[PDB]
Amino acid sequence: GLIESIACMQKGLPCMEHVDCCHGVCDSLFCLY
């Protein structure tokens, strides 16, 4: 789901877990930052 763990995907990449993005922001599930 969302939260817990720390993966890093670049800005504009598909993220389903809120922390999947290196900046920790998922919105409209793609790495917002």
Short mmCIF file of all heavy atoms in Angstrom, two decimals:
data_model
loop_
_atom_site.label_atom_id
_atom_site.label_comp_id
_atom_site.label_asym_id
_atom_site.label_seq_id
_atom_site.Cartn_x
_atom_site.Cartn_y
_atom_site.Cartn_z
N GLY A 1 0.83 -1.23 0.00
CA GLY A 1 0.00 0.00 0.00
C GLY A 1 0.85 1.25 0.00
O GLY A 1 1.75 1.39 -0.82
N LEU A 2 0.56 2.16 0.92
CA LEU A 2 1.33 3.39 1.03
C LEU A 2 2.02 3.45 2.39
O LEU A 2 1.53 2.87 3.36
CB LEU A 2 0.43 4.63 0.86
CG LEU A 2 -0.03 4.95 -0.57
CD1 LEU A 2 -1.00 3.90 -1.09
CD2 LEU A 2 -0.67 6.33 -0.62
N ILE A 3 3.16 4.15 2.45
CA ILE A 3 3.91 4.36 3.70
C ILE A 3 4.69 3.09 4.09
O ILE A 3 4.33 1.99 3.69
CB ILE A 3 2.97 4.79 4.86
CG1 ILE A 3 2.14 6.01 4.45
CG2 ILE A 3 3.76 5.10 6.13
CD1 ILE A 3 1.12 6.44 5.48
N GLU A 4 5.78 3.29 4.86
CA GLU A 4 6.69 2.21 5.28
C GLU A 4 7.64 1.83 4.14
O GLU A 4 7.22 1.77 2.99
CB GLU A 4 5.92 0.97 5.78
CG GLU A 4 6.81 -0.13 6.34
CD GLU A 4 6.01 -1.25 6.97
OE1 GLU A 4 5.41 -2.06 6.23
OE2 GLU A 4 5.97 -1.32 8.22
N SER A 5 8.91 1.58 4.48
CA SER A 5 9.96 1.30 3.50
C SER A 5 10.38 2.59 2.78
O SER A 5 9.71 3.62 2.91
CB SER A 5 9.52 0.22 2.51
OG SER A 5 9.19 -0.98 3.18
N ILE A 6 11.50 2.55 2.06
CA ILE A 6 12.01 3.74 1.38
C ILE A 6 12.63 3.39 0.02
O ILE A 6 13.83 3.14 -0.09
CB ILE A 6 13.07 4.48 2.24
CG1 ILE A 6 12.47 4.91 3.59
CG2 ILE A 6 13.63 5.69 1.51
CD1 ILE A 6 13.45 5.60 4.51
N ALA A 7 11.79 3.33 -1.00
CA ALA A 7 12.24 3.14 -2.38
C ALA A 7 12.42 4.49 -3.07
O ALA A 7 11.89 5.50 -2.59
CB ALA A 7 11.26 2.27 -3.15
N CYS A 8 13.18 4.54 -4.15
CA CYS A 8 13.37 5.80 -4.86
C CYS A 8 13.12 5.67 -6.36
O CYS A 8 13.85 4.98 -7.08
CB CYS A 8 14.78 6.34 -4.58
SG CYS A 8 15.36 7.65 -5.71
N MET A 9 12.06 6.33 -6.79
CA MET A 9 11.73 6.49 -8.20
C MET A 9 11.79 7.97 -8.56
O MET A 9 11.43 8.83 -7.75
CB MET A 9 10.33 5.95 -8.49
CG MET A 9 10.17 4.47 -8.19
SD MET A 9 11.07 3.41 -9.34
CE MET A 9 10.13 3.67 -10.84
N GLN A 10 12.25 8.26 -9.76
CA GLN A 10 12.46 9.63 -10.20
C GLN A 10 11.12 10.34 -10.44
O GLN A 10 10.08 9.70 -10.56
CB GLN A 10 13.29 9.67 -11.49
CG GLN A 10 14.71 9.12 -11.35
CD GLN A 10 14.76 7.60 -11.30
OE1 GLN A 10 14.71 7.00 -10.22
NE2 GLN A 10 14.87 6.97 -12.45
N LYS A 11 11.18 11.66 -10.51
CA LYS A 11 10.00 12.48 -10.72
C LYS A 11 9.35 12.16 -12.06
O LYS A 11 10.01 12.17 -13.10
CB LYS A 11 10.38 13.96 -10.66
CG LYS A 11 9.19 14.91 -10.75
CD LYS A 11 9.60 16.36 -10.52
CE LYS A 11 10.58 16.85 -11.59
NZ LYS A 11 9.96 16.88 -12.94
N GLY A 12 8.06 11.87 -12.03
CA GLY A 12 7.35 11.52 -13.25
C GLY A 12 7.26 10.03 -13.47
O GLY A 12 6.70 9.57 -14.47
N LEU A 13 7.80 9.25 -12.55
CA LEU A 13 7.76 7.80 -12.66
C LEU A 13 6.58 7.24 -11.89
O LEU A 13 6.09 7.86 -10.94
CB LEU A 13 9.06 7.18 -12.14
CG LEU A 13 10.33 7.54 -12.93
CD1 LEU A 13 11.44 6.58 -12.57
CD2 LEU A 13 10.08 7.52 -14.43
N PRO A 14 6.09 6.06 -12.29
CA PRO A 14 4.92 5.42 -11.67
C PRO A 14 5.20 4.99 -10.23
O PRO A 14 6.13 4.23 -9.98
CB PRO A 14 4.65 4.19 -12.54
CG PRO A 14 5.47 4.38 -13.77
CD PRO A 14 6.63 5.24 -13.38
N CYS A 15 4.39 5.48 -9.30
CA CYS A 15 4.53 5.10 -7.91
C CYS A 15 3.17 4.70 -7.36
O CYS A 15 2.16 5.33 -7.69
CB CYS A 15 5.11 6.26 -7.09
SG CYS A 15 3.93 7.60 -6.71
N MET A 16 3.12 3.65 -6.57
CA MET A 16 1.87 3.20 -5.98
C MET A 16 1.96 3.28 -4.46
O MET A 16 0.95 3.30 -3.76
CB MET A 16 1.53 1.77 -6.43
CG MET A 16 1.48 1.62 -7.94
SD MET A 16 0.20 2.64 -8.70
CE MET A 16 0.66 2.53 -10.42
N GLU A 17 3.19 3.31 -3.98
CA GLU A 17 3.48 3.48 -2.57
C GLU A 17 4.03 4.88 -2.36
O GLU A 17 4.90 5.33 -3.08
CB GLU A 17 4.49 2.40 -2.16
CG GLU A 17 4.90 2.44 -0.71
CD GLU A 17 5.82 1.29 -0.36
OE1 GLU A 17 7.05 1.43 -0.53
OE2 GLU A 17 5.32 0.23 0.06
N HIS A 18 3.47 5.58 -1.37
CA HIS A 18 3.76 7.00 -1.14
C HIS A 18 5.25 7.27 -0.98
O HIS A 18 5.74 8.33 -1.36
CB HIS A 18 3.00 7.49 0.09
CG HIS A 18 2.93 8.98 0.22
ND1 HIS A 18 1.95 9.75 -0.38
CD2 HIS A 18 3.72 9.84 0.90
CE1 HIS A 18 2.15 11.02 -0.08
NE2 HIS A 18 3.21 11.10 0.70
N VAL A 19 5.94 6.32 -0.37
CA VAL A 19 7.37 6.44 -0.12
C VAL A 19 8.21 5.91 -1.28
O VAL A 19 9.44 5.94 -1.22
CB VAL A 19 7.76 5.70 1.16
CG1 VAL A 19 7.12 6.36 2.37
CG2 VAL A 19 7.37 4.24 1.08
N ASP A 20 7.55 5.42 -2.33
CA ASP A 20 8.24 4.83 -3.48
C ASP A 20 9.05 5.89 -4.22
O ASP A 20 9.97 5.59 -4.98
CB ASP A 20 7.24 4.18 -4.44
CG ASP A 20 7.87 3.20 -5.40
OD1 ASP A 20 8.43 2.18 -4.94
OD2 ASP A 20 7.80 3.43 -6.62
N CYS A 21 8.69 7.13 -3.96
CA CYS A 21 9.37 8.27 -4.55
C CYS A 21 10.40 8.82 -3.58
O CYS A 21 10.15 8.92 -2.38
CB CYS A 21 8.34 9.34 -4.90
SG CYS A 21 7.02 8.72 -5.96
N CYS A 22 11.58 9.15 -4.11
CA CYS A 22 12.72 9.59 -3.32
C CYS A 22 12.39 10.84 -2.49
O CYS A 22 13.02 11.08 -1.46
CB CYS A 22 13.89 9.89 -4.25
SG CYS A 22 13.82 8.97 -5.82
N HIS A 23 11.42 11.63 -2.94
CA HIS A 23 10.98 12.81 -2.20
C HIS A 23 9.80 12.49 -1.29
O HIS A 23 9.36 13.34 -0.50
CB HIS A 23 10.59 13.95 -3.15
CG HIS A 23 11.75 14.62 -3.84
ND1 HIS A 23 12.15 15.90 -3.55
CD2 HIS A 23 12.56 14.18 -4.83
CE1 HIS A 23 13.16 16.23 -4.34
NE2 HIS A 23 13.43 15.20 -5.12
N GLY A 24 9.27 11.28 -1.41
CA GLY A 24 8.19 10.84 -0.55
C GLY A 24 6.85 11.48 -0.86
O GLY A 24 6.02 11.62 0.04
N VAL A 25 6.62 11.88 -2.10
CA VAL A 25 5.32 12.43 -2.48
C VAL A 25 4.72 11.71 -3.68
O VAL A 25 5.20 11.85 -4.81
CB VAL A 25 5.41 13.94 -2.80
CG1 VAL A 25 4.03 14.50 -3.10
CG2 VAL A 25 6.07 14.70 -1.66
N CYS A 26 3.67 10.95 -3.43
CA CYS A 26 2.87 10.36 -4.50
C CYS A 26 1.54 11.08 -4.63
O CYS A 26 0.81 11.23 -3.65
CB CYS A 26 2.64 8.86 -4.27
SG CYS A 26 4.07 7.82 -4.70
N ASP A 27 1.23 11.52 -5.83
CA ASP A 27 -0.04 12.18 -6.11
C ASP A 27 -0.46 11.87 -7.54
O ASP A 27 0.36 12.06 -8.44
CB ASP A 27 0.09 13.69 -5.95
CG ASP A 27 -1.24 14.40 -6.12
OD1 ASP A 27 -1.59 14.76 -7.26
OD2 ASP A 27 -1.95 14.60 -5.11
N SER A 28 -1.69 11.39 -7.75
CA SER A 28 -2.12 11.05 -9.10
C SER A 28 -1.14 10.01 -9.65
O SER A 28 -0.39 10.29 -10.59
CB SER A 28 -2.18 12.31 -9.98
OG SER A 28 -2.93 13.33 -9.33
N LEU A 29 -1.21 8.81 -9.07
CA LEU A 29 -0.03 8.01 -8.75
C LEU A 29 1.05 8.02 -9.83
O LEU A 29 1.11 7.18 -10.73
CB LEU A 29 -0.47 6.56 -8.48
CG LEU A 29 -1.38 6.38 -7.26
CD1 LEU A 29 -1.79 4.92 -7.11
CD2 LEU A 29 -0.69 6.87 -6.00
N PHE A 30 1.89 9.03 -9.66
CA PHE A 30 3.19 9.18 -10.29
C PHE A 30 4.02 10.01 -9.32
O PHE A 30 3.45 10.83 -8.60
CB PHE A 30 3.10 9.90 -11.64
CG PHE A 30 2.77 9.01 -12.80
CD1 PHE A 30 1.47 8.89 -13.26
CD2 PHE A 30 3.77 8.31 -13.45
CE1 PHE A 30 1.17 8.09 -14.34
CE2 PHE A 30 3.48 7.51 -14.53
CZ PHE A 30 2.18 7.39 -14.98
N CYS A 31 5.32 9.81 -9.28
CA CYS A 31 6.18 10.59 -8.40
C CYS A 31 6.05 12.07 -8.69
O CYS A 31 6.48 12.56 -9.73
CB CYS A 31 7.63 10.14 -8.51
SG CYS A 31 7.92 8.51 -7.77
N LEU A 32 5.44 12.78 -7.74
CA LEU A 32 5.14 14.19 -7.90
C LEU A 32 6.42 15.01 -7.80
O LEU A 32 6.65 15.92 -8.60
CB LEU A 32 4.11 14.61 -6.82
CG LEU A 32 3.33 15.90 -7.08
CD1 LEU A 32 4.18 17.12 -6.78
CD2 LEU A 32 2.83 15.94 -8.51
N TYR A 33 7.25 14.68 -6.83
CA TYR A 33 8.55 15.31 -6.67
C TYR A 33 9.64 14.27 -6.79
O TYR A 33 9.56 13.25 -6.08
CB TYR A 33 8.67 16.02 -5.32
CG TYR A 33 7.76 17.21 -5.16
CD1 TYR A 33 6.67 17.16 -4.31
CD2 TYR A 33 8.00 18.38 -5.85
CE1 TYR A 33 5.84 18.24 -4.16
CE2 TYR A 33 7.18 19.48 -5.71
CZ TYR A 33 6.10 19.41 -4.86
OH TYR A 33 5.27 20.49 -4.71
#
